[PDB]
Design an enzyme around this catalytic site. Structure first.
Site, PDB file in Angstrom:
ATOM      1  N   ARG A 153       1.006  -1.411   0.002  1.00 44.10           N
ATOM      2  CA  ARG A 153      -0.090   0.035   0.092  1.00 44.10           C
ATOM      3  C   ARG A 153       0.730   1.286   0.162  1.00 44.10           C
ATOM      4  NH1 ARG A 153      -0.639  -2.202   4.932  1.00 44.10           N
ATOM      5  NH2 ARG A 153       0.573  -1.365   6.537  1.00 44.10           N
ATOM      6  N   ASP A 170       5.363   6.445   0.775  1.00 42.82           N
ATOM      7  CA  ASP A 170       4.911   6.975   1.778  1.00 42.82           C
ATOM      8  C   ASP A 170       5.845   6.626   3.204  1.00 42.82           C
ATOM      9  OD1 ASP A 170       3.348   6.368   4.532  1.00 42.82           O
ATOM     10  OD2 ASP A 170       2.040   7.686   3.449  1.00 42.82           O
TER      11      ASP A 170
END
Ligand SMILES: C[C@H]1Oc2cc(cnc2N)-c2c(nn(C)c2C#N)CN(C)C(=O)c2ccc(F)cc21
Length: 294
Positions: A153, A170
């Site tokens: 993710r 991220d």
């Protein structure tokens, strides 16, 4: 304004490249979900625009600044680039390299080989993604940065097509720790000494990469199928490991199980992981293996 130190060099908000707001144009939403939306934008340089909700707390603001600092200071092809920021107008922006392929979890799930697209993905595609991220992880390791949430993710792809490049996109977990509760901790990506003693080292990311490998070769399944966080916690603490994803070559599964060694000293560093990924890609028995068709 808070300071940030990476590779022994200190930086502040003054080091961030402020791009004037009038030069920035939102095109379309790409998603929101977490705290804040992400837009596609132009500065003509195409960008992804991470926004800070104008309705936020001081810690939200500091968190936003810190991740801007963190990403701007990395310099590696497998970590998403920061084009700049726009912190002097509201809502505040972080400007990132536009990864048109989207996040890796969604990519894997949407691009699974299917009776219509029987050959949308091959083993080599997955091995290239794995190498790409392991390369980014090696860069973090050698600079003594611990990511703490290596997971599909949190990875992005440059494009949908075959020449796609995967990068870590991220760094929000590393940011929180640099400065959330139990139920939000990524326990399914965490080694035993992490969720028990709260101890983190470079070997923390090695374990997580093993789980990412499983995510990759399962084509986007949630780890430990059918298990809750606490069940995973007790399973892993007792020596339990995931089975091979469907059709996974044994050499690839072997990298996973080595990443999942209980003793962090017994787990490979990313140099070794890269070596073994490279060896898998050379081996015809691995790359000639057909992925399952949904
Ligand atoms: C901060 C954000 O960054 C980007 C998002 C995208 C592209 N490039 C960048 N830099 C993106 C996404 N989906 N799609 C269709 C596109 C496009 N084009 C994923 N997304 C909505 C996210 O929020 C997200 C998810 C994971 C992650 F690591 C970073 C991000």
């Amino acid at each position: 304004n808070p300071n940030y130190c990476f590779a022994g060099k200190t930086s502040s908000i003054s080091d961030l490249k402020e791009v004037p707001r009038k030069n920035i144009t939102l095109i379309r939403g790409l998603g929101h979900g977490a705290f804040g939306e992400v837009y596609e934008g132009q500065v003509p340089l195409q960008v992804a625009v991470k926004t800070l909700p104008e309705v936020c707390s001081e810690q939200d603001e500091l968190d936003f600044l810190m991740e801007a600092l963190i990403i701007s200071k990395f310099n590696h092809q497998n970590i998403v680039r920061c084009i700049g920021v726009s912190l002097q107008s509201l809502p505040r922006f972080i400007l990132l390299e536009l990864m048109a392929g989207g996040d890796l979890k969604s990519f894997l799930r949407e691009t699974r080989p299917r009776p219509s697209q029987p050959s949308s993905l091959a083993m080599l595609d997955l091995l290239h993604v794995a190498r790409d991220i392991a390369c980014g992880c090696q860069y973090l390791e050698e600079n003594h940065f611990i990511h703490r949430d290596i997971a599909a993710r949190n990875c992005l792809l440059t494009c949908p097509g075959p020449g796609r490049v995967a990068k870590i996109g991220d760094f929000g977990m590393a940011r929180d720790i640099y400065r959330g509760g139990c139920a939000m901790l990524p326990v399914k990506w965490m080694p035993p000494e992490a969720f028990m003693e709260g101890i983190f080292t470079s070997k923390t990311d090695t374990w997580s990469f093993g789980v990412l490998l499983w995510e990759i070769f399962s084509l986007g399944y949630m780890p430990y199928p059918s298990k809750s966080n606490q069940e995973v916690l007790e399973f892993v603490t007792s020596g339990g490991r995931m089975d091979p994803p469907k059709n996974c070559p044994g050499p690839v599964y072997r990298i996973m199980t080595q990443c999942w060694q209980h003793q962090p000293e017994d787990r490979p560093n990313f140099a070794i992981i890269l070596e073994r990924i490279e060896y898998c890609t050379q081996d015809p028995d691995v790359i000639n293996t057909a992925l399952p068709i949904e």
